[PDB]
């Protein structure tokens, strides 16, 4: 539905939608921009990520509320309330899966294949891992192991590139490590791997802070604090 709008106008409206906290609109504008077929700049990649992270974040939070109600409904001593809780959880789940499939579809057609610089390629592979991770959070069926492995594989390729091509303080590299560590802890039942990754990432970033300007130091230390927050929660 965005095919008739100029790329630049879509980007401008995505920024307006962000200011207005209209994240569904923001995501639709950024999807339209991606579908123009040109590569995205750093700023545009960030707009795409912000938009869909906010959309899927609302869906995930709602899914967790509904899943908890459904879980309580199926305890001993609970009174039968009918199919409605399951049905509504399923509705939200299907919408969430649709958003994840949309993002994964943009990455596959054709953002990843055209991304040659480390900053773009790592960013997109991180995103692929993230949206498979969100699919894994709700998965229960025959493909759940394959969904988890798809997240793992995308994160691993991103990690391999990031370690070769980026400094240990690079914010994309740090955010990738943060999210892969969460994957290990929450999805892959590997809390020790999660802790080891967070600690190694934190320590290697600490040792590289001396190379940075004040502004880059601020950027890197902010994400390092997220790593520390998780280490404090997990240990």
């Amino acid at each position: 539905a965005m095919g008739s709008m100029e790329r630049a106008s879509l980007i401008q409206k995505a920024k307006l939608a962000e200011q207005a906290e209209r994240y569904e609109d923001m995501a639709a504008f950024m999807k339209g921009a991606v579908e123009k077929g040109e590569e995205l700049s750093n700023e545009e990649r960030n707009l795409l990520s912000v938009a869909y992270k906010n959309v899927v974040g609302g869906q995930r939070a709602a899914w967790r509320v509904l899943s908890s109600i459904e879980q309580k409904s199926n305890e001993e001593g609970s009174e039968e309330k009918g199919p409605e809780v399951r049905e509504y959880r399923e509705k939200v789940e299907t919408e969430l899966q649709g958003v994840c499939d949309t993002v994964l579809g943009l990455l596959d057609s054709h953002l990843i294949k055209e991304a040659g610089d480390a900053e773009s390629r790592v960013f997109y592979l991180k995103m692929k891992g993230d949206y498979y991770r969100y699919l894994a959070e709700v998965a229960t069926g025959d493909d759940k192991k394959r969904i988890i492995d798809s997240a793992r594989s995308a994160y691993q390729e991103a990690m391999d590139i990031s370690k070769k091509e980026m400094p240990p303080t690079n914010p994309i590299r740090l955010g990738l490590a943060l999210n892969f560590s969460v994957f290990h802890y929450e999805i892959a039942n590997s809390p020790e791997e999660a802790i080891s990754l967070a600690k190694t990432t934190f320590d290697e970033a600490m040792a590289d802070l001396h190379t940075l300007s004040e502004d880059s130091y601020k950027d890197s230390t902010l994400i390092m604090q997220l790593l520390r927050d998780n280490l404090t929660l997990w240990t």
């Binding site: 992270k53 974040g57 991180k126 993230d130 955010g175 990738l176 943060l178 999210n179 969460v182 802890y185 929450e186 994400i223 997220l226 927050d229 998780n230 929660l233 997990w234």
Partner: peptide, 7 residues
């Protein structure tokens, strides 16, 4: 206290 991911 929910664990942090990259927001």
């Amino acid at each position: 206290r929910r664990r942090k991911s990259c927001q």
